[PDB]
Amino acid sequence: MTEYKLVVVGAGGVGKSHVW
């Protein structure tokens, strides 16, 4: 929950943050 983890991981974990 610092930038995208609040949306991608904040929802359940789509697997986008894995790229960054």
PDB file of N, CA and C in Angstrom:
ATOM      1  N   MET A   1       0.827  -1.201   0.000  1.00  0.00           N
ATOM      2  CA  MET A   1       0.000   0.000   0.000  1.00  0.00           C
ATOM      3  C   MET A   1       0.865   1.256   0.000  1.00  0.00           C
ATOM      4  N   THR A   2       1.780   1.339  -0.961  1.00  0.00           N
ATOM      5  CA  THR A   2       2.671   2.488  -1.070  1.00  0.00           C
ATOM      6  C   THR A   2       2.460   3.224  -2.387  1.00  0.00           C
ATOM      7  N   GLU A   3       2.000   2.496  -3.400  1.00  0.00           N
ATOM      8  CA  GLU A   3       1.755   3.083  -4.713  1.00  0.00           C
ATOM      9  C   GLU A   3       0.720   2.272  -5.486  1.00  0.00           C
ATOM     10  N   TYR A   4       1.077   1.040  -5.830  1.00  0.00           N
ATOM     11  CA  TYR A   4       0.180   0.162  -6.573  1.00  0.00           C
ATOM     12  C   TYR A   4      -0.297  -0.994  -5.701  1.00  0.00           C
ATOM     13  N   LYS A   5       0.469  -1.297  -4.660  1.00  0.00           N
ATOM     14  CA  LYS A   5       0.126  -2.379  -3.745  1.00  0.00           C
ATOM     15  C   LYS A   5      -1.205  -2.105  -3.053  1.00  0.00           C
ATOM     16  N   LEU A   6      -1.634  -0.849  -3.082  1.00  0.00           N
ATOM     17  CA  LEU A   6      -2.892  -0.455  -2.458  1.00  0.00           C
ATOM     18  C   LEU A   6      -4.076  -0.782  -3.365  1.00  0.00           C
ATOM     19  N   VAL A   7      -3.787  -1.029  -4.639  1.00  0.00           N
ATOM     20  CA  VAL A   7      -4.826  -1.358  -5.607  1.00  0.00           C
ATOM     21  C   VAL A   7      -4.690  -2.796  -6.093  1.00  0.00           C
ATOM     22  N   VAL A   8      -3.520  -3.126  -6.632  1.00  0.00           N
ATOM     23  CA  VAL A   8      -3.261  -4.469  -7.134  1.00  0.00           C
ATOM     24  C   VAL A   8      -3.327  -5.498  -6.010  1.00  0.00           C
ATOM     25  N   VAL A   9      -2.531  -5.279  -4.968  1.00  0.00           N
ATOM     26  CA  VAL A   9      -2.500  -6.186  -3.827  1.00  0.00           C
ATOM     27  C   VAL A   9      -3.608  -5.856  -2.832  1.00  0.00           C
ATOM     28  N   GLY A  10      -4.048  -4.600  -2.839  1.00  0.00           N
ATOM     29  CA  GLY A  10      -5.101  -4.178  -1.934  1.00  0.00           C
ATOM     30  C   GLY A  10      -6.431  -4.833  -2.245  1.00  0.00           C
ATOM     31  N   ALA A  11      -6.565  -5.346  -3.464  1.00  0.00           N
ATOM     32  CA  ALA A  11      -7.796  -6.003  -3.884  1.00  0.00           C
ATOM     33  C   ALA A  11      -7.721  -7.509  -3.657  1.00  0.00           C
ATOM     34  N   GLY A  12      -6.522  -8.065  -3.797  1.00  0.00           N
ATOM     35  CA  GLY A  12      -6.337  -9.491  -3.603  1.00  0.00           C
ATOM     36  C   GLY A  12      -4.999  -9.978  -4.122  1.00  0.00           C
ATOM     37  N   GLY A  13      -4.448  -9.264  -5.098  1.00  0.00           N
ATOM     38  CA  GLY A  13      -3.169  -9.646  -5.666  1.00  0.00           C
ATOM     39  C   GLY A  13      -3.290 -10.116  -7.103  1.00  0.00           C
ATOM     40  N   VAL A  14      -3.402  -9.166  -8.026  1.00  0.00           N
ATOM     41  CA  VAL A  14      -3.526  -9.488  -9.443  1.00  0.00           C
ATOM     42  C   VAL A  14      -2.218 -10.044  -9.997  1.00  0.00           C
ATOM     43  N   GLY A  15      -1.102  -9.493  -9.530  1.00  0.00           N
ATOM     44  CA  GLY A  15       0.198  -9.946  -9.988  1.00  0.00           C
ATOM     45  C   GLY A  15       0.923  -8.897 -10.809  1.00  0.00           C
ATOM     46  N   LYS A  16       0.552  -7.635 -10.613  1.00  0.00           N
ATOM     47  CA  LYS A  16       1.172  -6.535 -11.341  1.00  0.00           C
ATOM     48  C   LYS A  16       2.433  -6.054 -10.629  1.00  0.00           C
ATOM     49  N   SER A  17       2.322  -5.834  -9.323  1.00  0.00           N
ATOM     50  CA  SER A  17       3.453  -5.370  -8.528  1.00  0.00           C
ATOM     51  C   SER A  17       4.672  -6.262  -8.744  1.00  0.00           C
ATOM     52  N   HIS A  18       4.421  -7.536  -9.032  1.00  0.00           N
ATOM     53  CA  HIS A  18       5.496  -8.494  -9.262  1.00  0.00           C
ATOM     54  C   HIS A  18       6.477  -7.969 -10.305  1.00  0.00           C
ATOM     55  N   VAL A  19       5.971  -7.165 -11.235  1.00  0.00           N
ATOM     56  CA  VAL A  19       6.803  -6.595 -12.289  1.00  0.00           C
ATOM     57  C   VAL A  19       7.723  -5.511 -11.738  1.00  0.00           C
ATOM     58  N   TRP A  20       7.213  -4.737 -10.786  1.00  0.00           N
ATOM     59  CA  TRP A  20       7.989  -3.665 -10.175  1.00  0.00           C
ATOM     60  C   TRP A  20       8.541  -4.096  -8.821  1.00  0.00           C
TER      61      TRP A  20
END
